[PDB]
Each structure stands twice: as structure tokens, then as C-alpha cells.
């Protein structure tokens, strides 16, 4: 089922089997805990490795940051959790967290607690402020406690997953698990919550190849996710996007839409055996631990799709008083420029496709919802189906009753009145499109401008753009470029002689028809 | 042999000389908005509140150059972050409110911040 994604490899690092991957609670750093006996952290934005800590000489399964103390907790096959200062580089504390190696650690920023889960079938609580005294010991799990997560609706609650085919929800107060969920059938590798103030969910992953979704409120199993085609090592929920990201020991990661569980993507890397997953709680970074290293990956959807016409129908999709599937929104409010204005939505009629991009017409007569290689046109404020068309991309031009589309045949297309224009068809190839009157099409390390008159190459500007937008006179253009910005002059008369003559080269243009104004 | 006619040409070395050369070609009312000076400068007070407090000072200075009466001391440039349009969205004053403090951030930053509210406005 369609979803705004864009998987990007933010940083990779090669090392012996990383059991845990973490994002720093408040920092842009991601910590991965390796089987090098070392845990290493790298800030995968500037691509700087901030620090490493040698916890043990035998594997460190878990590592997490207790950001407030400016300390990191690690649990290694020393059967200890050792604490270090990540800016004063020394070991803050050393303590025996368990009688066995520590698979996962969870940190409660609001309490002094870390509870750690270990394969001594017990999860123990340590309080950093007491100098890592044992606050509470939880006895409930009768098997290897693979992972621990804290519920974000009550931090006093956590769930622990154990290979005993349950995930047990426990409270701090109570050694014993205050209720048990039987979340899986072939042991539970992982537990995660689907984050938020109104989301009572659990996930279980198991070596029966499957990840299962559970609702902790209702206690039923919402659905079963195919997971992988081999034992699901870990599974987690993405917060923002409706998906579940799972990893398997087959070296494959799969992304599943959390609305029908149909395969959004399968990712392999040449690192293989993907042991863990974790997700950033502020959303759009997930990190996955593999045998041969760790990766931090960045998921797509960073920005919203919307457009403001002149009718006061400012239309978005998703959001409040609007559904994603259907289309709506209005914004007729003019309250003070210094704050964010209300939603001010008024209801808007039918849709039939998903909005990859959803946009009102710039002067208010059309609405366009674009999605899945198709555009559907709905009427400005009535929303009856006006028109239809093809569009992997749709952009309104300046004309906005002429628009540019990428129909993805290797020629950038113009559709006029939502009907295809074949008097427009670049003598460039295409790789991408910029709208406005002279359509910019990017191909062969060039930006070429084409005529909506006879589709000849007017000029080529040798710095490719981000965008072309053309003024509403179509003589002046504003080019968004990595250069920074251009304003160019299209001299109309010069173009008419040049285009007719076709003195403008197929892939290089005529450097006179356009001139660079500034 | 230092001073280039260029922007750069590459590499940390050229880059380090370059901020020296830039300060020459615009000395006028401090650097104002710190150049490539910013990178070393944080480490210069790694102990830990003092960096923010300092940073807050520069940010306040930078906003505007006011009258400069008794505790109205903001230098740097007169317009470069203005103050106070009525069409500016979501306004300059939001950052100005931080500087009004009870302790709203921590004490070192607090002492700097109270002076800094006084200083801009």
C-alpha cells in the first residue's frame, strides 16, 4: 500500500556483531553495542565518531545513554553494567547487573532507573544516583531476557521479552510481572511499544519467522506480520510512519505498512544477519544491528504536501479534520502573524487515490491529488471529478492550467487542461523535471529549458537546478540551484527566431534566446 | 606566506588563515556574527554552563545595537536581526523572553540572561 518513504544510509560502521543499536535520548548520536567488547558511538550527522568505551574484552550486548548524567550504560559478558562519562572519558561506575550477560538496558530519564534484561532470566533495576545500587529485582521471566523497553505512557511500566513465548508487562513496584501477554509462539526476542500518549501497543518478534502486533489495551493480537522469510531476530514500530521495521538473520530488513501489512520494501546491505532494530522516538531514523557491523538509516517523509489557492481552501492531506485517503482543508483565519494560526478547516468532497502530493490550484479552480503514477483532479470547492491524468510527479506551473508532469518515459511532459501536450516533448532525454513556463528538464549534467511552443532547446544552463519556477509573464525565471539562485531573462523575440531556426543544439542549446540576468 | 586573493582554495590550513584574513576585511564593531572562529570557541569553556551563558551574550549583542545606556549595552550591528516588526512571524521576541529569567535555565546562564534582557530592551 503506498507510503512516503526514502531509505538513506546515514552512517555505517563495520565491527563484530552488534547486538544493540540505540539512538542517544536527546543527542544526534547513535550508539551501537558490539561484540568487540567495545561499544562505539558515532554522530551520524557530521560523520564524526564521538567516543568508544571498552566495557569488556568479551562482547557487550547492550548499550544506552543516560543523557542527564552525561553517562552511558553498557552491559557486557562481564555480567556487569559499567558506566562511563562520555565527555570526561573514564569509567563512572562498575557494578554487577546480573548473573549473566546483559542483552538490553532501558533508561528512564524521569526516574534514576535503568532496568536491564539479562539471560539469567531476570531483569534487575539499578539506580544511577545511588551509585548503581540494586533498587529492585524483577523475577518473573523463566527464560533468556532478550530485550527490555519502557512504556512511554507510564515509565514505571516496562515490558521485557524473553524466549519463554511471552512478553510480560511489569511494574517497578512489583518484582513480579503484574500481567503476562503470550505474544509469540517460538519465544519473544523483542518488545517495543508503539510510542505516544495514546498508543497502548506491544510488538513481539519471534524465531518462527514472524513478528506479531498486539494491542495491550484489548489484549488481542491485532495482526501477524510475515516479518521475514527466516527467523525474525527483532521487530520494532516506527512512531511517525505507519510501518513496522523488522530484521532477520537472513541479512534482510523489511518494512511493512501497518494498515494492511503489504511489503513496503526489502533491504539487504552485504552486512547480513540483522539482529536488532530500534527506532528514534522523535522519528525518521531507525538503526539496525548486523553481524558485520551496524548501520544507521534515515527514513523518508520529512516535509508535508500542501497548497494554498486564492479561495482560502488551503489543502493538505492527513492532519486534523481531514483524512489521508480523502481530501480536505481550509484556512480562512488571519489571526496575527507572530503565532501559528488555527487549522480553520472546512470539509471537502471525494477522492479516489492516495496523496503522494495533494495541492490546490494557485488561483482556485482545481484541486489535484497526485498519487501512484496517476493524478486525479477534483473541482476547487465542489470536489467532483473534473479530470484525470498520469503523473509520477505533478507540479502546477505558473499557468496552472498548464502543468508539468513526469510521465517517466524519459521525456518530461506537459499536460494542458489535464490532457497530454505532445507539442511538448524535450529533445533532451529526462532525468527530472522543474515546472514553470520554460520547462526545465535535467539530463546529461545539464538543465535544458523547453518551449511550450515547439519543444526546441532554448538554452541549457550548466548548473542543474533544484527548481525552476517562471514568473507569470514567462520572461523572468527563478532558478533554485546548488549555485544558490539565478534570475534569467527569456527574451521572447530572440527565442522565436532561435526556436524556429532550431539553432539551439539537442543537448547544449543556443546560448542566446535566454540570457543570465543575475 | 599568508593572505590569499581568493575565497580559499581548500584544506583546514588555508581555512584557518582565511578567518584571520576575513576579520581584516571587516573589523567594524567586533566580528558581530562569528566567522570560523565558532569551532575552537566552544571548547574554550568546556566546563559547561559557561559556553551557553557566553553564547547567549553574543546572540543578544547581535540582535541589535540599542541606545547603550545603563545596562542597555547591546553593541554589534544595528540591523542584522532587527527588533520588532508587527508582520514578522513568529517574531524576534520569543528569543528575547528566554533572557527574562527567574532561573529558567541554570544559574550561570541566569545571571548572564537577566543582564541580557535588560541590555536589548
Swiss-Prot record, chain A:
GO terms for biological process: intra-Golgi vesicle-mediated transport; intracellular protein transport; retrograde vesicle-mediated transport, Golgi to endoplasmic reticulum. Oligomeric complex that consists of at least the alpha, beta, beta', gamma, delta, epsilon and zeta subunits. Probably interacts with PEX11A. Interacts with SCYL1. Interacts with JAGN1. The keyword Disulfide bond does not apply. It comes from the Eukaryota. Disruption phenotype: The knockout of the gene results in early embryonic lethality with no viable embryos recovered at 12.5 dpc. It is found in: Cytoplasm, Cytosol; Golgi apparatus membrane; Cytoplasmic vesicle, COPI-coated vesicle membrane. Its main location: cytoplasm. The coatomer is a cytosolic protein complex that binds to dilysine motifs and reversibly associates with Golgi non-clathrin-coated vesicles, which further mediate biosynthetic protein transport from the ER, via the Golgi up to the trans Golgi network. Coatomer complex is required for budding from Golgi membranes, and is essential for the retrograde Golgi-to-ER transport of dilysine-tagged proteins. It is a peripheral membrane protein. Keywords: Acetylation, Coiled coil, Cytoplasm, Cytoplasmic vesicle, ER-Golgi transport, Golgi apparatus, Membrane, Phosphoprotein, Protein transport, Repeat, Transport, WD repeat. The chain holds residues 1 to 518 of 905 of the full protein. The lineage of its organism: Eukaryota, Metazoa, Chordata, Craniata, Vertebrata. Belongs to the WD repeat COPB2 family. The gene is Copb2. The keyword Acetylation applies. WD repeats lie at residues 13-52, 55-94, 97-136, 140-180, 183-224, 227-266, 350-388, 390-425. GO terms for cellular component: COPI vesicle coat; cytosol; Golgi apparatus; Golgi membrane. This is Coatomer subunit beta'. One of its GO terms (molecular function) is structural molecule activity.
UniProtKB/Swiss-Prot annotation, chain B:
It comes from the Eukaryota. Predominantly expressed in the upper one-third of the oxyntic mucosa and in most regions of the pyloric mucosa. Ubiquitously expressed including platelet, liver, heart, spleen, lung and kidney. HEAT repeats lie at residues 13-49, 50-87, 89-121. It is found in: Cytoplasm; Golgi apparatus membrane; Cytoplasmic vesicle, COPI-coated vesicle membrane; Cell membrane. Brefeldin A induces dissociation from the Golgi of the beta-COP and presumably the other coatomer subunits. Oligomeric complex that consists of at least the alpha, beta, beta', gamma, delta, epsilon and zeta subunits. Interacts with CAPN8. Interacts with SCYL1 and PRKCE. Interacts with COPG1. Interacts with ARF1 (myristoylated); this interaction is required for binding of COPB1 to Golgi membranes. Interacts (via trunk domain) with ARF1 (via switch I region); the interaction is direct. Interacts with KCNK2 (via N-terminus); this interaction increases the channel-mediated whole cell currents and promotes plasma membrane expression of KCNK2. Interacts with STX17. Interacts with TMEM115. The coatomer is a cytosolic protein complex that binds to dilysine motifs and reversibly associates with Golgi non-clathrin-coated vesicles, which further mediate biosynthetic protein transport from the ER, via the Golgi up to the trans Golgi network. Coatomer complex is required for budding from Golgi membranes, and is essential for the retrograde Golgi-to-ER transport of dilysine-tagged proteins. This is Coatomer subunit beta. The chain holds residues 228 to 348 of 953 of the full protein.
